[PDB]
Design a binder for this molecule. Structure first.
Ligand SMILES: Nc1ncnc2c1ncn2[C@@H]1O[C@H](COP(=O)(O)OP(=O)(O)O)[C@@H](O)[C@H]1O
Ligand SMILES: Nc1ncnc2c1ncn2[C@@H]1O[C@H](COP(=O)(O)OP(=O)(O)O)[C@@H](O)[C@H]1O
Ligand SMILES: Nc1ncnc2c1ncn2[C@@H]1O[C@H](COP(=O)(O)OP(=O)(O)O)[C@@H](O)[C@H]1O
Ligand SMILES: [Mg+2]
Ligand SMILES: [Mg+2]
Lengths: 49, 48, 436, 48, 432, 243
């Protein structure tokens, strides 16, 4: 039994992909795959209009 | 009967001031996955 | 870009208002006809009404095809998507070559979306769910400019509990999505314990409610990869899918068409704008016959961008074929679909001008005699070799104590380093000793 | 109404108007997209 | 505004330009000349529309620039969007994930559309009260703008309601047959003026009419989509990702039988379509061998193909065949030959392209451009159309003149001039 | 200057690899020096162009300095009651009792800490590592709580792999990187430029050494031709003995 490898990095690296909400748009308006299994043709075509 | 010669835990990522949301999110993900999957792994107990 | 690259001096095509090419402007020297053609191509790209038009830049090595493409990119600006790819980048080990080509095609097409974002940010002073199940959540956020009480949609309570949000924590809540991020504890509570594993963050300065109207550019490929795999999901299959290694996938044409329909809907609504953009393929001779055949169909699409090719090969064998030769390594059928821009070789005066421009860009002072010697070397061997001799010669000058390049430094560097022709002569003179 | 303030009530009604506009815009945005397939189609096409 | 669909190489083609007798007009729906080829395409299109005969193959052969892809796009446009038209290139079947035969099978099953028709009784209303006594038995109250009733719930209904966290003010629909509950939205009250909303919440009006309703859904799916749906547990995700793999033949046979059963029951209709493979010469000998026997199925669409090869080498072999296609497959297909265009046809095509791009050209400019197109190629002249339009706009002109065409002819080279200039400086270029 | 390429050519046994090793030794550990062979870019895990992109990005480092509070001492007494707790730590010069929070109590419970152990704690993270027992390592001498400046040099490849996916840093140790998307790489390049402009980080260009570069094929050479033209390209050094 060996101790694990402790890999140390800069704290700024973990925030590299992070973008503040005031600097990014809502990608949920293009979410097509998220509607599958949750949204029906009835809701989109007959009810909501 | 074959045992690995060495056994280690997975490598850990350490930062002095990490985003305070990453670790709790990973902990919750692991907890949910364990609560859903550990009962299903009981048959492999003798092999392990 | 703090560091100086090979084309760090190219700022534009250097044309005038009439489209005619100045002799030396925007870092470009000579190649007047090619620069005028690239100006016409830039005017084509700006007039967004044409799709799938393709251009080939054909000429000897070192004549400025990549520089001309980068000048086109600079002329367009950062608002127009310029996707640079190398012909050998289509040989992926995860997806087929045609998928790589179509992914780059969609990368070149850009979409501009104008949106106002609202975020509630501050330290939590109260978190009270209101029972009717929970009808709503009343939260209290504090900033330097005051306190605000907010009524939250009950679906946000689950997110708040997952994020472990308590009083004294500094959080933000997205108005449009209900996303909650707990970005640490407030530093006013830093002394509540002598030793806690907590990240203490200053209180936000502005108002609790922050509004910003932003314009963000996305490409069709971003929406494609966003709709290739699901995100989130509390099901066991979704969680186990989060552990799976992310692999590029051959996105279906059904998904592409549906995303095109969504984009058209949002363009009609008036919140989106389309920027067709440019895809630059360098070393296109590294594409094989299958890639060229797929390009035949892709360029004929009404959705494709403007594609610029570059080739320095002469009459050479197409990569995927056995013995079929073509004028630029490109099948005659694809050559029939492109407008060819020809780049010519440079005169000694043009080489001296380019060497001077490179010296100015690299922050190097060079004397007139040193510049003439470098130009003579470039005439003897290559423009690239002379440009690459500037920095080592400047380093020798700095070591010797001189702030300018003299002729002796250039001579010493030409002695220290060899060009392709001199090394080839040495190799031919010593064939037996070198490895075969 | 001795303690009534006109500016405070104007601010409050402006806030209410902004809240209602936000509710409308978000309700329109969250139901704008139609599924590629939909639950009915997938259920019909899914054999046991 | 600028939509995602912009002026392409075939944006001017709206159809085949035929009359009721399939006689091609000289210039109709954006097509010029190619009378025999257009008549053959119209006959094939009538064959497609009838749908009786399965696995028919047609090869559109001719010299480059003679309108093969133009004719294919005309057939696709003339054919309704109801009938599937899968257009793929020959190079797209070489995949790192599935074999060539699997790719061709998937394209074939993508070319047959299945229109489904499901009628389902549903309950639709806004939730007023949910009372559960103790998770054993409870009552649910639903309302519309014209109705309101109370329901007795069982164990599974209560569990499903608790799983979906249905509460008061939610507008939901419940399927009577299966009991599944999907939430449409929630009603707006004075107390629901939220400052922040979740990503899925939306406010809708209370439904009107009667609480019990019938839902009719009609959609068109392909056989390949049903195969991908039934390939794995969440196979519909592969309809987005494309990570289908090689579907088992047993699954395909089961789905064929189930589709036949639906067709007999009246719940589905078959719309056989067209698979267009452009530049088929890129297919290998194995792909041709598979195509030979794939066309013999009763669920095979019409296969339209296009090559511009002469007697050349078949890929994957050392043999020479008239189109790059082995003669066994060529005996299975009808060949439509395209002839080169004349001066009048070239001028008419240039006029149509100019009208499509909204470019005004003088008649002298048209004569010069037609001469260039005959001398070099039609596509070169088509590109020069836009080049000359841009140059004319640069000099603040309104109509393209001969000077603009000469200017863009000097600026942009065709293949012949570029090849000559390269031969002049052959030693400069690499790997001659 | 970015993307400068040098070839060391000569007969076998003439010090080419010796010259490369001397160049690597003259540079300190601070500057990255990635040494690979031409054969190493041929992989079943990724493409050749992806392999050369990872070779390039391994050669450019991002130096980030940050300050942390480090508590190093010998444990005297640990008390936890049903949550509240106390911790007593001592050095050779001072002794102190700490009032513990919930998270630090959990961290000390997870890693068994008893009296006499010499441990160091990172205050912001609770990272407790036991470095021996004293009554074997001598107890620390000076102040118990020290503010330290920690400097990390992180390669662009490391940033890309860490931010490629959740728990993605494991791929820095087990391969398994796949082919990182160009969007992630462009985002990382933009963020690194932002850091450099804002002073949060410094760029340390390094050296990529490809011994026996003649094993590369035409596709890899064509990729290198344009990969050297980026502003984030390192200095490329190659060696070959071929005529
Ligand atoms: N007309 C020019 N003006 C300024 N710099 C040039 C010109 N032509 C080439 N260069 C420079 O010479 C170098 C090599 O040219 P390159 O763009 O690689 O030519 P090609 O793409 O034809 O190989 C580049 O760094 C480029 O900046
Ligand atoms: N009969 C026609 N009518 C109108 N345009 C045509 C006709 N034939 C060819 N074209 C045009 O010529 C160009 C090349 O022909 P296309 O059919 O696309 O390729 P090919 O025939 O060489 O396979 C297309 O842009 C098309 O619009
Ligand atoms: N100029 C030199 N000074 C010191 N040691 C050398 C020198 N040249 C070669 N060597 C040593 O002799 C051996 C020869 O290897 P080397 O010359 O590097 O092979 P290659 O020609 O493939 O680079 C090496 O172990 C190297 O350390
Ligand atoms: Mg064609
Ligand atoms: Mg060696």
């Amino acid at each position: 039994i060996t101790p694990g490898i402790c890999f140390s990095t800069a704290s700024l690296v973990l925030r590299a992909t992070d973008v503040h909400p005031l600097q990014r748009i809502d990608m949920g308006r293009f979410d097509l795959i998220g509607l599958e299994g949750r949204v029906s043709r009835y809701e989109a075509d007959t009810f909501l209009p | 009967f074959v045992m690995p010669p060495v056994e280690a835990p997975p490598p850990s990522l350490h930062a002095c001031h990490p985003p305070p949301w990453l670790a709790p999110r990973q902990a919750a993900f692991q907890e949910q996955l364990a609560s859903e999957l550990w009962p299903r792994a009981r048959p492999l107990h003798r092999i392990v | 870009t703090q560091r100086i690259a090979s084309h760090s001096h190219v700022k534009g095509l250097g044309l005038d208002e009439s489209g005619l090419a100045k002799q030396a402007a925007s870092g470009l020297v000579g190649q007047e006809n090619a620069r005028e053609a690239c100006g016409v191509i830039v005017e084509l790209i700006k007039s967004k009404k044409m799709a799938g038009r393709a251009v080939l830049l054909a000429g000897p090595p070192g004549t400025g095809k990549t520089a001309l493409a980068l000048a086109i990119a600079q002329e367009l600006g950062s608002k127009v998507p310029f996707c640079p790819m190398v012909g050998s980048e289509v040989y992926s080990t995860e997806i087929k070559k045609t998928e790589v080509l179509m992914e780059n095609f969609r990368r070149a097409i850009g979409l501009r979306i104008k949106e106002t974002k609202e975020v509630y940010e501050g330290e939590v002073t109260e978190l009270t769910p209101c029972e009717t199940t929970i009808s709503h959540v009343i939260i209290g956020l504090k900033t330097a400019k005051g306190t605000k009480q907010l009524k939250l949609d009950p679906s946000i309570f689950e997110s708040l509990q997952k994020e472990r949000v308590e009083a004294g924590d500094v959080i933000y809540i997205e108005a449009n999505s209900g996303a909650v991020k707990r970005q640490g504890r407030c530093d006013t509570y830093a002394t509540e314990f002598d030793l806690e594993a907590e990240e203490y963050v200053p209180l936000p300065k502005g108002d609790v409610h922050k509004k910003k109207e932003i314009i963000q550019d996305v490409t069709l490929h971003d929406l494609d990869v966003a709709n290739a795999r699901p995100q989130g999901g509390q099901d066991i299959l979704s969680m186990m899918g989060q552990l799976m290694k992310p692999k590029k996938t051959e996105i279906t044409d059904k998904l592409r068409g549906e995303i095109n329909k969504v984009v058209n809907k949002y363009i009609d609504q008036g919140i989106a704008e389309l920027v067709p953009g440019v895809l630059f393929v360098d070393e296109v001779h590294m594409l094989d016959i299958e890639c060229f055949t797929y390009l035949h169909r892709a360029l004929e699409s009404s959705i494709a961008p403007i594609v610029i090719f570059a080739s320095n090969r002469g009459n050479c064998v197409i990569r995927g074929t056995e013995d079929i030769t073509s004028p630029h390594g490109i099948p005659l059928d694809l050559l029939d679909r492109v407008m060819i821009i020809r780049t010519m070789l440079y005169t000694p005066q043009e080489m001296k001008q380019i060497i001077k421009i490179r010296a100015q860009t690299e922050g190097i002072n060079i004397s007139e005699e040193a510049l003439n010697h470098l130009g003579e070397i470039g005439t003897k061997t290559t423009l690239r070799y002379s440009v690459q001799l500037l920095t080592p010669a400047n380093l020798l000058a700095k070591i010797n104590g001189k702030d300018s390049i003299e002729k002796e430094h250039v001579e010493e560097i030409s002695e220290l380093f060899y060009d392709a022709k001199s090394s080839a002569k040495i190799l031919a003179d010593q064939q037996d000793k070198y490895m075969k | 109404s001795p303690f009534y303030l006109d500016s405070l009530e104007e601010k409050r009604k402006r806030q209410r108007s902004e809240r209602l506009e936000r509710i409308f815009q978000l309700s329109e945005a969250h139901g704008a997209l139609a599924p590629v397939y939909g639950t009915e189609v997938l259920d019909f096409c899914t054999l046991p | 505004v600028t939509r995602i669909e912009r002026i392409g190489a075939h944006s001017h083609i709206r159809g085949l330009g035929l009359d009721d007798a399939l006689e091609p007009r000289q210039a109709s729906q954006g097509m010029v000349g190619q009378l025999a080829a257009r008549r053959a395409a119209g006959v094939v299109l009538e064959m497609i529309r009838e749908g009786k005969i399965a696995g028919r193959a047609v090869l559109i052969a001719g010299q480059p620039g003679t309108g093969k892809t133009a004719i294919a796009m005309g057939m696709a446009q003339a054919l309704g969007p109801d009938t599937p038209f899968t257009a793929i290139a020959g190079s797209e079947i070489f995949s790192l994930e599935m074999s060539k035969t699997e790719a061709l099978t998937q394209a074939f099953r993508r070319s047959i559309g299945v229109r489904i028709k499901e009628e389902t009784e549903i309950i639709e209303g806004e939730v007023v009260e949910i009372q559960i006594d103790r998770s054993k038995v409870g009552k649910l109250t639903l309302k519309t703008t014209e109705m309101e009733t109370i329901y007795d719930l069982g164990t599974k209904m209560i569990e499903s309601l608790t799983k979906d966290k249905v509460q008061a003010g939610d507008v939901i629909t419940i399927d009577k047959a299966t009991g599944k509950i999907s939430k449409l939205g929630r009603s707006f009250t004075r107390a629901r003026d939220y400052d922040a909303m979740g990503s899925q919440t939306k406010f809708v009006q209370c439904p009107d009419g009667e609480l019990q309703k019938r839902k009719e859904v009609v959609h068109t799916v392909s056989l390949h989509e049903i195969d991908v749906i039934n390939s794995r547990t969440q196979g519909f995700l592969a309809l987005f990702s494309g990570d289908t793999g090689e579907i088992k033949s047993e699954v395909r046979e089961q789905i064929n039988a189930k589709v036949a059963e639906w067709r007999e029951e009246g719940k589905a209709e078959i719309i056989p379509g067209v698979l267009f493979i452009d530049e088929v010469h890129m297919l290998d000998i194995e792909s041709f061998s598979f195509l030979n026997r794939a066309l013999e199925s009763d669920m095979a669409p019409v296969l339209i193909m296009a090559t511009n090869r002469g007697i050349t080498r078949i890929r994957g072999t050392s043999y020479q065949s008239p189109h790059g296609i082995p003669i066994d497959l060529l005996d299975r297909l009808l060949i439509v030959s395209t002839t080169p265009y004349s001066e009048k046809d070239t001028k008419q095509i240039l006029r149509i392209r100019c009208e499509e791009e909204d470019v005004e050209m003088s008649e002298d400019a048209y004569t010069v451009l037609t001469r260039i197109g005959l001398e070099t190629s039609l596509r070169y002249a088509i590109q020069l159309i836009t080049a000359a339009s841009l140059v004319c706009r640069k000099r603040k002109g309104t109509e393209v003149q001969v000077d603009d065409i000469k200017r863009v002819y000097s600026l942009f080279l065709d293949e012949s001039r570029s090849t000559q200039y390269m031969k002049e400086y052959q030693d400069a270029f690499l790997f001659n």
